Enzyme design. Structure first.
Site, PDB file in Angstrom:
ATOM      1  CD  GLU A  92      -2.815  -1.673   0.800  1.00 17.35           C
ATOM      2  OE1 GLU A  92      -2.996  -1.151  -0.319  1.00 17.35           O
ATOM      3  OE2 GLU A  92      -3.637  -2.449   1.329  1.00 17.35           O
ATOM      4  CD  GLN A 137       0.510  -7.300   1.047  1.00 17.49           C
ATOM      5  OE1 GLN A 137       1.123  -7.005   2.072  1.00 17.49           O
ATOM      6  NE2 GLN A 137      -0.803  -7.148   0.929  1.00 17.49           N
ATOM      7  CB  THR A 175      -1.460   5.586  -7.099  1.00 15.47           C
ATOM      8  OG1 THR A 175      -2.361   4.719  -6.400  1.00 15.47           O
ATOM      9  CG2 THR A 175      -2.153   6.907  -7.380  1.00 15.47           C
ATOM     10  NE  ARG A 187      -6.265  -1.310  -1.047  1.00 15.36           N
ATOM     11  CZ  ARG A 187      -5.671  -2.495  -0.990  1.00 15.36           C
ATOM     12  NH1 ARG A 187      -4.533  -2.729  -1.623  1.00 15.36           N
ATOM     13  NH2 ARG A 187      -6.231  -3.466  -0.275  1.00 15.36           N
TER      14      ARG A 187
HETATM   15  N1  LIG Z   1      -5.042  10.483  -0.206  1.00 20.31           N
HETATM   16  C1  LIG Z   1      -4.041   9.881  -0.841  1.00 20.31           C
HETATM   17  N2  LIG Z   1      -4.203   8.594  -1.309  1.00 20.31           N
HETATM   18  C2  LIG Z   1      -3.192   7.970  -1.959  1.00 20.31           C
HETATM   19  C3  LIG Z   1      -1.983   8.615  -2.160  1.00 20.31           C
HETATM   20  N3  LIG Z   1      -1.166   7.769  -2.825  1.00 20.31           N
HETATM   21  C4  LIG Z   1      -1.830   6.610  -3.047  1.00 20.31           C
HETATM   22  N4  LIG Z   1      -3.087   6.721  -2.514  1.00 20.31           N
HETATM   23  C5  LIG Z   1      -4.147   5.699  -2.525  1.00 20.31           C
HETATM   24  O1  LIG Z   1      -3.754   4.556  -1.790  1.00 20.31           O
HETATM   25  C6  LIG Z   1      -4.205   3.372  -2.419  1.00 20.31           C
HETATM   26  C7  LIG Z   1      -3.090   2.334  -2.447  1.00 20.31           C
HETATM   27  O2  LIG Z   1      -2.168   2.626  -3.472  1.00 20.31           O
HETATM   28  P1  LIG Z   1      -1.547   1.436  -4.358  1.00 20.31           P
HETATM   29  O3  LIG Z   1      -0.962   1.986  -5.599  1.00 20.31           O
HETATM   30  O4  LIG Z   1      -2.559   0.401  -4.657  1.00 20.31           O
HETATM   31  O5  LIG Z   1      -0.377   0.855  -3.421  1.00 20.31           O
HETATM   32  P2  LIG Z   1       0.530  -0.383  -3.901  1.00 20.31           P
HETATM   33  O6  LIG Z   1       1.915  -0.209  -3.412  1.00 20.31           O
HETATM   34  O7  LIG Z   1       0.493  -0.525  -5.372  1.00 20.31           O
HETATM   35  O8  LIG Z   1      -0.118  -1.665  -3.181  1.00 20.31           O
HETATM   36  P3  LIG Z   1       0.678  -3.062  -3.188  1.00 20.31           P
HETATM   37  O9  LIG Z   1       0.704  -3.630  -4.616  1.00 20.31           O
HETATM   38  O10 LIG Z   1       2.118  -2.823  -2.702  1.00 20.31           O
HETATM   39  S1  LIG Z   1      -0.086  -4.162  -2.144  1.00 20.31           S
HETATM   40  C8  LIG Z   1      -4.670   3.746  -3.817  1.00 20.31           C
HETATM   41  O11 LIG Z   1      -6.050   3.493  -3.933  1.00 20.31           O
HETATM   42  C9  LIG Z   1      -4.418   5.231  -3.942  1.00 20.31           C
HETATM   43  O12 LIG Z   1      -5.565   5.875  -4.445  1.00 20.31           O
HETATM   44  C10 LIG Z   1      -1.812   9.910  -1.692  1.00 20.31           C
HETATM   45  O13 LIG Z   1      -0.745  10.493  -1.865  1.00 20.31           O
HETATM   46  N5  LIG Z   1      -2.845  10.541  -1.032  1.00 20.31           N
END
Ligand SMILES: Nc1nc2c(ncn2[C@@H]2O[C@H](COP(=O)(O)OP(=O)(O)OP(O)(O)=S)[C@@H](O)[C@H]2O)c(=O)[nH]1
Ligand SMILES: C=C[C@@]1(C)CC(=O)[C@]2(O)[C@@]3(C)[C@@H](O)CCC(C)(C)[C@@H]3[C@H](O)[C@H](OC(C)=O)[C@@]2(C)O1
Ligand SMILES: [Mg+2]
Lengths: 333, 890
Positions: free
Chosen positions: A15, A170, A20, A144
């Protein structure tokens, strides 16, 4: 022309917002399924809030007792593998979201595990209730989706080619990282700076920030990344600013050194900036630069950047700066 | 060696022959030039008697000119020896024509000086022949004075001096002939030795490489060769130990295992089992060569091809199925003589393989993929005596072959398999042929590179002391020549003669200071330093040349002495000194030689012209003044031309030999570097003694190489988790990154093997993800078992560390045993070191029947390190036997 192309990979904890970042970069320079994932994300958010109403050790006070059958309905359909999408369920969800007890339960989201985009979609029940619109790109960025494997996105900006590498975060997916540790231009490390309050969902004991620090320590001292010169991308800056402005949770409460820490002399003078957010972001950045510099040999270097993946202007500015860095780095001085 | 020395004479004959080609051409010019001026002297035509003998003499020189060319083309050189005799007799006869008849009335004594020098300078006649040829002219000069008594009337005395004038030609002539021949012997000897060393090193290089190429096909040996040469400046940026793997498509994999190995293993001992195994597998290697296979490895009782791996074939599985039929036929053949029941089972599959090598020690060609695992499982299916043609292969060959329904159910029903001399002459010839127009200057014979000429100049003149001695004798003879010659100021000319004869002796002692050991070292060093640098020797060579000229002219300057032609021959007696000085450069010799003629031209014109006039009227005769000054420069012309061409040819030969020596040395250096690279690769591939035994003869004469040992420990190390880790997706190329991780693990193990703590342990082979090492093979006490145990513990530590560096968990299954083994090579064509015995099978079984992360060990013969788990009771393959497990030292 393989040498001309640049290969970049986003290594970070769970996460961390790397996906994103990839989506925003894709829409910067170049259906109903996405609507379905938005519905599922809102669904998971409301079901987790309703469950956390009673799952937490400290009980959360409820709304008017008459408005309780809604809670029972959300609890009942949550167990159902195929969650329904009728207008009555959306009315139930809106009724919960407007309730003050549910608001207080949401304000304690750091105790349990909940997606960070919960409130954005919860404010969208009224528009999602009709189930007839197409969400905008900003609402698309709030989705997400779990990333299992590793993915590549071909890129091309200003007549030079770039290669993207999105990977999972993960602990189960960290074994697949070695598959793309060869001949990589740079590492774009993404760390959720606002996740200092919550904990990882795999062990439920260690802090998310502590896990990210351990991951960065492992990456920096990796024997197969001696000369790779990672780039650091602090994310979720707006969430960190909001959390530190609210005052409910503090960085000192989970890191004793923060209280004694002072803002460094060198700083970015943002007109819309507070001393608290600056001291927090600089404390996090100084922790990362300390762990990087303690093992520094001069073979590889780190350039920390503050990034908010939601807005596109910060993304494009940081991407331009990092593109200059990668060009100077490919110069191979 | 009379054959080799005669061979040198054939080579030496041609080089000296090239000199007489121009000199016979020089002679015909001499006859016509003298004939022309005699015609121009008198308006009336000359005597018809005069023209006929010169006509024979000026015509025979054309014949010899046209006779040397054909003989050079001919392989034989007998006429080249004759040509020197034919030329010598022709010019020697010229004396009789003048002495008795008319002949060449010009010149006279001076002409005999020219030819008598010639027969020691350019004639390819050997040194022994030269003395006879030289004495023939000298004794005939005695005949000349008898047939011309008026010449003795001119000078009642000095006739002995006239012989003395011809004596130093013999003295100085043998010096040029002997030293020039001796230097030619060294050049021929050296170019014979250098080619011998080059051929010696090339056969070893081709023999060494032929064994390296026996294994490790060319398309990876080239990559290794390029890698070890350090093609780029440096490879200071490396993150992985690099791999030599490649991906291939449309290949087929065979397999074969003996069904009843254990039943017959206990029946007979190790030696007989190894013998039958080698016989079967050598016949099988012959079959594989016949049917276009190439075997990958032989593990235990297993043998497997790869079909069309280095080169593609449209019918790739056809070769595998044909040689599998051959497998069945050979098993039936060995089934004869009612010996045993070693019948096996064959499985064939077609797909894509990753071929290459892993690790840093004992490189071996292997293939890793999922499809080779399918082939292994198909072989492990069963029904010995029958092949497996599962769907990936039945649709490959054709529909023309009839096969049964395949296995019903024998293997685990996972993944839905869906079963259904002259060289030296050309060595010399190509030197001149290439260098006809190359680095050497066409006329100045100068190398284009400044350094090449400079490194020639630093070479010391090994005959410099002897060569400068020659200049002393001739200068000493002209002193004796003139001492008895009369002059007005006998004493004043002797004072200058004493100074000049001391001036040459002054250089003699300086240039023999090194020769004078009694003289101090500082003087000796100067003598060495004189010859060390070419320029310092050039000025001395020029200096000693002048003293002969100053001594030869100062007598004439005293004259204001009635014999002006005898003083001219002293200059001729000085022109030989230039020819004596072989080492000095040709164009530099012309410049100094042109000084001699110019001064004499100035001293033969109006200056001292009257002294020539009084000689003309006294002799009178028939217009003989054409033999005077009119011929004095005529003699100087031919003498100068001969001396210049002698120097030019000598320098030509010397420069050619030097250049070819440099080229040969460069070739030797390059070949030595290639030898070093091949030696490094061979050392990395095979052990020392096995490589030495297989390098020489008896590679195939002795079909089996083997040796029996008594106390040997055997260890296995397996990684069961790599099969789960391995996956062939698109992100990783086809699993290349997984093989890179495996190569990293194996390279870490190999690097750990190189520590001084582990000297008794040698790695034998690697079986997929399994690592096998033995202990105490070379006896040079039970300490080697302790070394093997420490090696296993270090392997566990290394795997833990690399697990920490990566992001996944790996565990090692270690199996040890101790006993007696048999070590040897099972394939004569492809040498792969291997060991056999009963303890090897026990070790493999103990590794297979074990728990990950723990070491299983037989009866504990050691008390140094404490073990545990005595009550394990593992049945194994031989019989039930309860023995312990292996913890750390404490
Ligand atoms: N408010 C806010 N939300 C954010 C920001 N950056 C990412 N998010 C939100 O958090 C959520 C998780 O981001 P994501 O891209 O899925 O993490 P990830 O690293 O890819 O997840 P994983 O594959 O390691 S499990 C997304 O739905 C995104 O909209 C931010 O800077 N501000
Ligand atoms: C490392 C490669 C991988 C995953 C796939 C493969 O082709 C193998 O290397 C073969 C089949 C393959 O190399 C052929 C020889 C042999 C000895 C049969 C190997 C072992 O079965 C390996 O398994 C083990 C566990 O050693 C295995 C199967 O493991
Ligand atoms: Mg993701």
């Amino acid at each position: 022309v393989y040498r001309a192309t640049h290969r970049l990979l986003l290594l970070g904890a769970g996460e961390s917002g790397k996906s994103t970042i990839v989506k925003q970069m894709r829409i910067l320079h170049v259906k109903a399924t996405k609507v379905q994932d938005i519905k599922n994300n809102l669904k998971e958010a409301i079901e987790t809030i309703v469950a956390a109403m009673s799952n937490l050790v400290p009980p959360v006070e409820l709304a008017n007792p008459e408005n309780q059958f809604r809670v029972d309905y959300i609890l009942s359909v949550m167990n159902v593998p195929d969650f329904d999408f009728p207008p009555e369920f959306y009315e139930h969800a809106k009724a919960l979201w407007e309730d003050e007890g549910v608001r207080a339960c949401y304000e304690r989201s750091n105790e349990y595990q909940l997606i960070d985009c919960a409130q954005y979609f919860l404010d969208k029940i009224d528009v999602i209730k009709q189930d007839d619109y197409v969400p905008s790109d900003q609402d698309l960025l709030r989705c997400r989706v779990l990333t299992s494997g590793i993915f590549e996105t071909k890129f091309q900006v200003d007549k030079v080619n770039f290669h993207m590498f999105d990977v999972g975060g993960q602990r189960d997916e960290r074994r697949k990282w070695i598959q793309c540790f060869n001949d990589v231009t740079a590492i774009i490390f993404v760390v959720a700076s606002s996740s200092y309050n919550m904990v990882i969902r795999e062990d439920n004991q260690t802090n998310r920030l502590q896990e990210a620090l351990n991951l960065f320590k492992s990456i920096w001292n990796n024997r197969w990344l001696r000369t790779i010169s990672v780039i650091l991308f602090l994310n979720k800056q707006d969430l960190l600013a909001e959390k530190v402005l609210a005052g409910k949770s503090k960085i000192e409460d989970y890191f004793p050194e923060f209280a004694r820490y002072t803002t460094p002399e060198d700083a970015t003078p943002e007109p819309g900036e507070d001393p608290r957010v600056t001291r927090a972001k600089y404390f996090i950045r100084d922790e990362f630069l300390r762990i990087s510099t303690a093992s520094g040999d001069g073979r590889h270097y780190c350039y920390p950047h503050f990034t908010c993946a939601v807005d596109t202007e910060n993304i494009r500015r940081v991407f331009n700066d990092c593109r200059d860095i990668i060009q100077r780095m490919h110069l191979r001085q | 060696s009379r054959d080799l020395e005669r061979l040198y004479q054939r080579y030496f004959l041609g080089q000296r022959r090239k000199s007489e080609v121009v000199m016979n051409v020089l002679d015909v010019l001499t006859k016509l030039t003298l004939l022309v001026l005699h015609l121009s002297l008198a308006s009336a035509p000359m005597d018809p008697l005069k023209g006929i003998l010169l006509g024979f003499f000026t015509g025979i020189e054309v014949v010899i000119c046209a006779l040397v060319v054909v003989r050079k083309d001919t392989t034989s050189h007998t006429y080249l020896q004759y040509s020197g005799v034919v030329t010598w007799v022709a010019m020697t006869t010229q004396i009789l024509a003048a002495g008795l008849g008319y002949g060449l009335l010009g010149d006279g004594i001076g002409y005999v000086l020219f030819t008598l020098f010639a027969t020691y300078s350019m004639l390819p006649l050997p040194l022994t022949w030269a003395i006879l040829a030289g004495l023939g002219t000298s004794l005939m000069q005695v005949v000349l004075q008898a047939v011309i008594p008026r010449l003795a009337v001119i000078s009642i005395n000095q006739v002995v001096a006239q012989a003395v004038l011809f004596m130093c030609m013999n003295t100085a002539g043998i010096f040029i002939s002997y030293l020039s021949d001796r230097a030619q012997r060294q050049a021929f000897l050296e170019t014979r030795r250098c080619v011998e060393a080059r051929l010696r090193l090339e056969t070893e290089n081709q023999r060494q490489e032929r064994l390296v190429l026996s294994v490790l096909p060319r398309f990876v040996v080239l990559e290794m060769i390029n890698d070890m040469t350090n093609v780029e400046d440096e490879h200071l940026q490396h993150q992985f130990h690099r791999i030599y793997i490649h991906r291939y498509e449309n290949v087929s994999i065979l397999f074969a295992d003996v069904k009843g190995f254990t039943n017959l293993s206990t029946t007979l001992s190790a030696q007989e089992l190894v013998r039958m195994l080698n016989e079967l597998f050598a016949r099988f290697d012959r079959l594989a060569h016949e049917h276009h296979c190439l075997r990958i490895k032989i593990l235990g009782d297993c043998y497997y091809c790869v079909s069309g791996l280095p080169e593609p074939r449209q019918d790739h599985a056809h070769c595998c199925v044909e040689m599998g039929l051959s497998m069945i036929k050979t098993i039936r053949y060995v089934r004869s003589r009612t010996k045993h029941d070693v019948d096996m089972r064959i499985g064939i599959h077609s797909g894509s393989v990753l071929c290459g090598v892993l690790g840093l020690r004992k490189w071996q060609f292997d293939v890793w993929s999922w499809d080779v695992d399918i082939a292994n499982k198909l072989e492990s299916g069963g029904i010995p005596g029958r092949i497996h043609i599962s769907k990936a292969t039945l649709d490959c060959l054709n529909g023309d072959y009839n096969v049964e329904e395949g296995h019903g159910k024998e293997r685990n029903e996972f993944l839905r398999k869906h079963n259904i001399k002259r060289i030296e002459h050309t060595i010399d010839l190509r030197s001149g042929d290439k260098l006809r127009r190359e680095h050497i200057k066409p006329f100045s014979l100068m190398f284009k590179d400044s350094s090449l000429e400079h490194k020639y100049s630093q070479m010391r003149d090994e005959v410099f002391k002897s060569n400068l001695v020659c200049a002393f004798i001739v200068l000493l003879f002209i002193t004796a020549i003139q001492s008895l010659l009369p002059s007005s100021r006998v004493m004043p000319m002797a004072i200058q003669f004493s100074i000049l004869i001391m001036l040459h002796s002054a250089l003699v002692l300086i240039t023999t200071a090194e020769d004078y050991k009694c003289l101090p070292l500082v003087l000796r060093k100067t003598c060495c330093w004189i010859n060390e640098t070419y320029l310092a020797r050039n000025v001395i060579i020029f200096a000693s040349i002048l003293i002969n000229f100053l001594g030869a002219i100062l007598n004439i300057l005293w004259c204001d002495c009635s014999y002006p032609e005898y003083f001219v021959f002293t200059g001729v007696l000085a022109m030989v000194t230039c020819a004596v000085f072989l080492r000095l450069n040709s164009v530099l010799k012309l410049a100094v030689l042109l000084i001699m003629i110019a001064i004499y031209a100035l001293l033969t014109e109006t200056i001292y012209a009257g002294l020539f006039l009084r000689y003309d009227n006294l002799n009178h005769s028939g217009e003989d003044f054409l033999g005077t000054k009119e011929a004095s420069l005529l003699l100087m012309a031919m003498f100068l031309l001969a001396v210049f061409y002698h120097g030019q040819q000598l320098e030509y030969t010397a420069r050619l030999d030097f250049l070819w020596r440099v080229q040969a040395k460069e070739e030797i250096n390059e070949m030595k570097e290639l030898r070093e690279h091949n030696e490094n690769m061979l050392r990395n591939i095979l052990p020392s003694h096995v490589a030495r035994h297989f390098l020489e003869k008896d590679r195939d004469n002795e079909e089996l190489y083997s040796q029996s040992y008594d106390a040997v420990g055997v260890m296995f190390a397996s990684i069961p988790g790599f099969a789960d880790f391995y996956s062939q997706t698109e992100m990783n190329n086809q699993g290349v990154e997984c093989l890179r991780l495996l190569n990293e693990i194996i390279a870490d193990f190999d690097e750990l093997l190189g520590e001084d703590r582990f000297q008794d342990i040698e790695k034998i082979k690697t079986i997929g993800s399994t690592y096998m090492a033995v202990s105490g093979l070379s006896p040079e006490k039970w300490g080697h078992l302790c070394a093997l145990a420490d090696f296993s513990l270090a392997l566990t530590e290394s795997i833990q560390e690399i697990n920490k560096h990566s992001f996944n968990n790996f565990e090692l299954r270690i199996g040890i045993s101790h006993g007696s083994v048999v070590a040897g090579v099972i394939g004569a064509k492809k040498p792969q070191y291997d060991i056999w015995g009963k303890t090897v099978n026990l070790a493999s079984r103990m590794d297979s029947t074990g728990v990950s992360g723990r070491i299983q060990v037989p009866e504990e013969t050691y008390l140094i390190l404490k073990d545990q788990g005595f009550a394990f009771d593992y049945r194994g393959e031989i019989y039930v036997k309860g023995i312990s497990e292996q913890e750390g030292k404490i």
